Design a protein around this ligand. Structure first.
Ligand SMILES: *[C@@H]1O[C@H](CO)[C@@H](O[C@@H]2O[C@H](CO)[C@@H](O[C@@H]3O[C@H](CO)[C@@H](O)[C@H](O)[C@@H]3O)[C@H](O)[C@H]2NC(C)=O)[C@H](O)[C@H]1NC(C)=O
Ligand SMILES: *[C@@H]1O[C@H](CO)[C@@H](O[C@@H]2O[C@H](CO)[C@@H](O)[C@H](O)[C@H]2NC(C)=O)[C@H](O)[C@H]1NC(C)=O
Ligand SMILES: *[C@@H]1O[C@H](CO)[C@@H](O)[C@H](O)[C@H]1NC(C)=O
Lengths: 535, 122, 132, 122
């Protein structure tokens, strides 16, 4: 079940193949036994090549099996294929009679031998092609006809003078650079699946049933495999050519009953179930762009398609790109609160998990706009910068460390609800989203209004707390760009009330924002805020 | 009349039963227990008072009681009963009875998979 | 076979269940409960080496398979309280029947090196005791 | 660790226990035996040398050893166990164990008891 790879693989004889399988990188899985095996009929699942030094007799000289532990993958090569090699197969780990496997289907076909009467043209659907047929000048004034064969009958439905087939509508144009020589061609844009096969082509006709053979093959693209897990993020890379660099471009998901279903467009559409956890970047000079989807759930598994078409949907005659995604779900990404609540005037605090092996990174805090396509304006970084309009009410803190940092956002209002993102600078990027809701109530800690200052004498400011906070520590701090640091002239007078602080001199040097806080040593808690003046 | 919880069965101590009556219009009621045909003395069991319910217009009342017996008596096959007296009943009494074999399931499939045939999936 | 109620690894038992509802006669449906036991035929009673013969009696109580004790969070009025979810898991003392694939098991054996004897440590499941 | 052959058990003088290690890449090993939990001295058994086995891919090696013990103790129910030390193992030693019941038993007895299957599983 947590094992994944290519479901279908194809090649022709004499060639090589290179299969890759995936497993969760836990320590038991890196050291256990890997196998490739042939699921035959009558029960058994006989091993062909293994990780513990075993190579079979039929695979002698042709194969090996290398294991990459930091990837979490292992690769299998089979050279010099055949037609006894067609069948179903399995990757795996451990013992074969359990089920830590994944099925793979291998199909291999016969090549052409001593039949070189062919002229091929390779194309992926959405591009241009030529089908060249011999232009004879001994039929100088004769039609350059090209039939189509359904069965054995060359059906008279395409002429070369302005008559085209009722199914090949609007897209057949041809060029004149011979006209005295053998040179004409037919150029087709937007190749379909139904535009395949050999066609009865010729240029000019002596009446004695003369023939010619020349085919095309158009191919469907092969999906890049992406391996993700629960509560993580993914990134696609649509990289179509500059021929469609100014068409509307889309991204959907193939479903069961022949129904692609839109996830984003560039004409402004979105699913209901992807609100707050998706992006779409502005493209570069050559026409490639990024798509991010974070917080991955169980039902995001399946084939995805990106393309370009003039109305923003999947229609035939448009160039595509593919991916196939797997969600591991035996993940080691820690769980987190998805929604955090607060009241008008209160604070919040978020736990933001990253990877322990990337602890020398740089941390960021977004706010998902959702207006154009999706955008992160950055609000605060780990290096000492904050936004302008969030002054006095935001800071990022490195404690507790070792898997997790925290961020404090107070002085709430009912328009502060939304979806928020956090992101590190390392190589592997989990992006974690939390929703801030606003419900009504009363703030726990209690401070006065906006406290002025006298010129030439002292100030004192109180700050209460209720009685469940009687075992938690109390502190004060002064806020600047790097965060806020605790002060030593607080007293914490009462046993269950009135943490205060005075300022020994009214000069302008500390005319800033102040907080009043609560913490259980490492983990932080609620706070409030007042701004000081000097008159 | 409710059966015991399955947590108490797998410990071999006393097990517990619950009687419950609800929906009666004056708040006067009597509750007695039986074992087979013998009425137990009324200092073996606890009975709460009679209180009224949240409702829709018409007002009604409810009452519970419990009785704790030994697990060997339950697993023998001895039955127990809860009797309720009230004045809106025509014969002034109702009974319910419980033992094992009361909420037994009606379909059981047992398949034994031998050696040489393991096919476990993850 | 749709919703997993328990997947226990000390006893190696798995229990799923599923409601499959008929539309005609809405007073009666059917509720299915599937149990799978895998019996190890070559394990000892205590898991060390010289203990006792093959374990030949295997006992499963449903109230100890389905037991759930790691704490949870409940929101009562506007509060987050931590609750336990079971009466019976006082701390182990449980006898396990199988090994667990993600935990490793060692033993201690005395051998001699010419002079005095040492306290050599020995792996019992070698795939899982790799120090990294 | 292989059990004794069936023919040696009838004669009732001594039995023999075979310890085979197979498929390891450097050719240095260590073999020691235990009875109960106490290490036997070196002169009780016989160990051959490490040699290279026919090729199926990578080149690997093998070794054997035998120990002869009294046929009364095999039926009293003592246990004997074999230890192998090699460079590639995780904690440098591993062991396997055998006695009279495990290994050619002529008897498989197993009892499975499933207590309260209809039992409000939470
Ligand atoms: C199942 O078998 C194991 C293996 O014998 C038992 O674990 C160990 O049992 C011994 C015997 O009492 C305990 O011995 C102690 O060892 C320490 C050294 O670590 C020594 O300093 C003490 O003086 C004492 O002799 C040991 O605590 C214990 N646990 C280990 C090694 O982790 C186990 O108790 C057996 N279980 C049952 C239910 O029989
Ligand atoms: C992770 O797997 C990839 C699979 O493509 C490895 O990439 C190539 O591995 C071969 C060795 O078999 C090298 O010769 C190539 O240079 C690798 N890179 C590319 C771009 O082809 C990769 O080596 C694996 N990771 C590690 C750390 O080895
Ligand atoms: C053996 O493995 C190497 C990589 O380790 C690979 O490049 C080579 O193709 C393999 N040999 C075969 C398939 O004959």
């Amino acid at each position: 079940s947590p094992i994944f790879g290519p479901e279908e693989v194809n090649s022709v004889e004499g060639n090589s193949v290179s299969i890759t399988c995936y497993y969760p990188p836990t320590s038991v899985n890196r050291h256990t036994r890997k196998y490739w095996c042939r699921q035959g009929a009558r029960g058994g699942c006989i091993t062909l090549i293994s990780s513990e030094g075993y190579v079979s007799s039929k695979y002698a000289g042709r194969a090996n099996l290398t294991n990459f532990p930091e990837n979490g993958t292992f690769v299998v090569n089979i050279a010099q294929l055949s037609q006894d090699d067609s069948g179903r197969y399995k990757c795996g780990l451990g013992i074969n009679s359990r089920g830590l496997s994944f099925d793979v289907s291998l199909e291999v076909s016969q090549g052409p031998g001593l039949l070189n009467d062919t002229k091929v043209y390779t194309v992926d659907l959405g591009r241009t092609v030529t089908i060249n047929c011999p232009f004879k000048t001994e039929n100088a004034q004769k039609r350059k006809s090209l039939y189509k064969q359904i069965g054995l009958y060359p059906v008279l439905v395409i002429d070369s003078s302005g008559y085209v087939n009722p199914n090949y509508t609007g897209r057949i144009r041809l060029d004149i650079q011979g006209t005295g020589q053998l040179l004409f061609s037919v150029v087709i844009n937007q190749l379909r699946l139904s535009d395949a096969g050999q066609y009865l082509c010729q240029a000019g006709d002596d009446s004695n049933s003369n023939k010619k053979n020349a085919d095309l093959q158009v191919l469907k693209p092969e999906p890049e495999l992406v391996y993700e897990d629960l509560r993580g993020s993914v990134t696609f890379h649509c990289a179509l050519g500059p021929e469609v660099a100014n068409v509307a471009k889309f991204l959907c998901r193939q479903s069961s009953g022949e129904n692609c279903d839109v996830v984003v467009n560039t004409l402004g559409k979105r699913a209901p179930a992807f609100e707050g956890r998706i992006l779409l970047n502005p493209q570069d000079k050559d026409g490639s762009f990024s798509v991010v989807i974070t917080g991955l759930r169980k039902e995001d598994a399946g084939r995805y398609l990106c393309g370009a078409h003039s109305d923003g949907q999947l229609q035939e005659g448009s160039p595509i790109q593919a991916w196939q995604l797997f969600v591991n779900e035996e993940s080691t990404i820690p769980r987190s609160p998805t929604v955090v609540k607060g009241v008008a005037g209160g604070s919040v605090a978020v736990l933001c998990p990253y990877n322990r092996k990337e602890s020398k990174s740089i941390k960021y805090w977004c706010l998902w706009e959702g207006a154009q396509n999706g955008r992160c304006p950055l609000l605060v970084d780990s290096e000492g910068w904050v936004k302008a309009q969030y002054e006095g009410r935001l800071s990022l803190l490195e404690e507790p460390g070792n898997g997790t940092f925290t961020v404090i956002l107070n002085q709430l209002t009912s328009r502060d609800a939304g979806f928020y993102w956090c992101l590190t600078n390392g190589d592997t990027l989990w992006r974690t989203t939390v929703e801030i809701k606003i419900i009504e109530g009363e703030p726990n800690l209690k401070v006065p209004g906006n406290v002025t200052a006298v010129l030439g004498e002292t100030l004192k400011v109180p700050c209460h707390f209720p009685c469940k906070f009687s075992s938690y520590e109390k502190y004060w701090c002064k806020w600047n760009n790097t965060g806020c640091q605790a002060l030593p002239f607080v007293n914490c007078d009462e046993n269950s009330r009135l943490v205060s602080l005075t300022l020994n001199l009214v000069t302008r040097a500390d005319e800033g924002w102040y907080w009043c806080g609560v913490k259980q040593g490492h983990f932080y808690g609620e706070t409030a805020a007042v701004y000081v003046a000097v008159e | 009349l409710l059966p015991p919880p399955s947590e108490e069965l797998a410990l071999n101590e006393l097990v517990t039963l619950t009687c419950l009556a609800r929906g009666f219009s004056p708040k006067d009621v009597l509750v007695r227990w039986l074992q087979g045909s013998q009425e137990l003395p009324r200092e073996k069991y606890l009975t709460w008072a009679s209180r009224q319910e949240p409702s829709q217009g018409t007002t009604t009342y409810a009452v519970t009681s419990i009785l704790r017996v030994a697990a060997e008596d339950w697993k023998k096959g001895e039955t127990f009963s809860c009797m309720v007296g009230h004045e809106a009943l025509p014969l002034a009494f109702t009974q319910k009875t419980i033992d094992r074999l009361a909420g037994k399931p009606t379909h059981i499939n047992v398949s034994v998979v031998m050696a040489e045939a393991d096919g476990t999936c993850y | 076979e749709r919703i997993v109620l328990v997947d226990n690894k000390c006893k190696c038992a798995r229990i799923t269940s599923r409601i499959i509802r008929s539309s005609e006669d809405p007073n009666e449906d059917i509720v299915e409960r599937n149990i799978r036991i895998i019996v190890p035929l070559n394990n000892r009673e205590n898991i060390s080496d010289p203990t006792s013969p093959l374990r030949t009696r295997f006992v499963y109580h449903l109230s100890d398979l389905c037991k759930k004790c790691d704490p949870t969070e409940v929101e009562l009025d506007n509060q987050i309280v931590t609750a336990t979810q079971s009466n019976i898991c006082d701390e182990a003392t449980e006898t396990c029947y199988t090994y667990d694939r993600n935990k490793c098991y060692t033993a201690v054996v005395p051998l001699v090196y010419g002079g005095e004897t040492k306290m050599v440590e020995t792996a019992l499941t070698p795939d899982a005791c790799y120090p990294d």
